[PDB]
Amino acid sequence: EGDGSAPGGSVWQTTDYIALSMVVYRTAIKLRNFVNIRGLTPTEMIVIPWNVMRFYCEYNTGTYGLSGNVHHKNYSMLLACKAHRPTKVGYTLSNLILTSDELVSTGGTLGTTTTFNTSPYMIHSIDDQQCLSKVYPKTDTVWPVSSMRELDYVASTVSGDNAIIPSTIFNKNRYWKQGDDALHFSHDLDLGFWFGSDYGNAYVPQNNDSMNAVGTIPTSKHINVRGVNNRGMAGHYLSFPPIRTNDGQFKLNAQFTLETEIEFEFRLWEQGVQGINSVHTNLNPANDSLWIQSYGSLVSITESKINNIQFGPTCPRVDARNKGGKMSMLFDHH
């Protein structure tokens, strides 16, 4: 009888500190942008940097990326809590506006204007078969990270002597016209672990031939969280259909709104004296390293400029038993 505080019977025991340390809180970062794609020939193609973490949670448009600390403030506090995990990520292309430079000439006096009819389209390509494993900027151009969210990144897909029309090689190609419904693209992440640091121009976690989701080198004589199972994202791209003119190719320009959303889960500090700031340094659990794992693989950045983008999708020809849910396993290292 009683709560146990009596001399005999059951032991009075203190309240549970786990329950509040395991509660998963779930937030998101939503951002809108206007994208203007101009002067894109049918060979060259816009690379959607949609597999890089910085695309969703940091707003790089125009002058913003030049100014400092453009991260969304929900993300700045995800570094205040002890663990965060990116979970689902996605974006939306909406309200396409095509314009034409066909009336434009060096003499001027006539500017670009929307296409005379709505038959033209912009091709949204998803490369499932990974025709392009690794994508580089065009010879003259370069990819700024400050420019990331307005989609200027132009790749020229070229065989040895052959200029590749991107829509022809890629698997899913959506021909998206003026008036069509918005194009919604999403990726679900199921991670068995959490991140304690900032992404820092890392790809949003993927398990692929190109990259793995967990970023820490596992170390000897204990168990470490290890990536497994091949979850990855398909290399999205934007291109225009080749249309021949009296001279060269038809000039198609596109506008659309870019709505990106990344949904973070985060988790808070240990209850009790363990969570006191002064004593948490040396009372921090050493098994954080077990479930808290940093970021796996970084985009290649020299200066502020992206060197290349790797995609590596969950390829359909991997055994379906490998392609399943959980992206990490807790496995030892000798």
User: Using CB under 5 A, which of the segments 8-16, 22-30, 267-275, 312-320 binds Ca ion?
Assistant: 8-16
165-224 residues near Ca ion, rule: CB under 5 A: 180
| Cβ nearer to Ca ion, comparing 93 with 262 | 93
Residues in contact with its own copies, shown as a per-residue x/- string from 154 to 173 under the rule CB under 8 A: -----xxxxxxx-xxx-xxx
259 is in the binding site of which of Ca ion, its own copies, none (Cβ under 5 to 8 A by kind)?
A: its own copies
List CB contacts of 151: < 8 A, sequence separation 6 or more.
35, 37, 46, 47, 48, 49, 238, 258
Burial class (CB in 10 A: 0-12, 13-18, 19+), 39: exposed
Q: Nearest Cα to 215, choosing from 230, 193, 232, 190?
A: 193
Among 241, 301, 305, 307, binds its own copies (CB under 8 A): 241
> How crowded is the C-beta side of 232, counted as CA atoms within 13 Å?
29
Window 115-144: residues binding its own copies (CB under 8 A)? 115-121, 124, 128-134
Q: Binding to its own copies (CB under 8 A): which residues in 201-240?
A: 207-212, 214, 217-218, 221-223, 225-230
Min dist. Cβ of residue 107 to its own copies (A): 6
Smallest distance from the beta carbon of 10 to Ca ion, in angstroms? 5
d(CA 296, CA 192): 13
Q: What angle do CA 291, 294, 298 make, to 5 degrees?
A: 145
CB of 304 to its own copies, least distance (A): 16
CA angle 63, 148, 127 (to 5 degrees): 160
Site for its own copies in 270-329 (CB under 8 A): 270-280, 282-283, 285-287, 289-291, 297, 312-313, 315-319, 321-322, 326, 328-329
Question: Which one among 10, 141, 186, 200 touches its own copies, defined by CB under 8 A?
Answer: 10
Beta bridge partners of 90: 186, 261
Q: For residue 266, what is the enclosing H or E element?
A: strand 252-267
CA 316 to chain centroid, in Å, comes to: 20
Total residues contacting its own copies by CB under 8 A comes to 184
| Binding stretches for Ca ion (CB under 5 A) | 4, 6, 9, 180
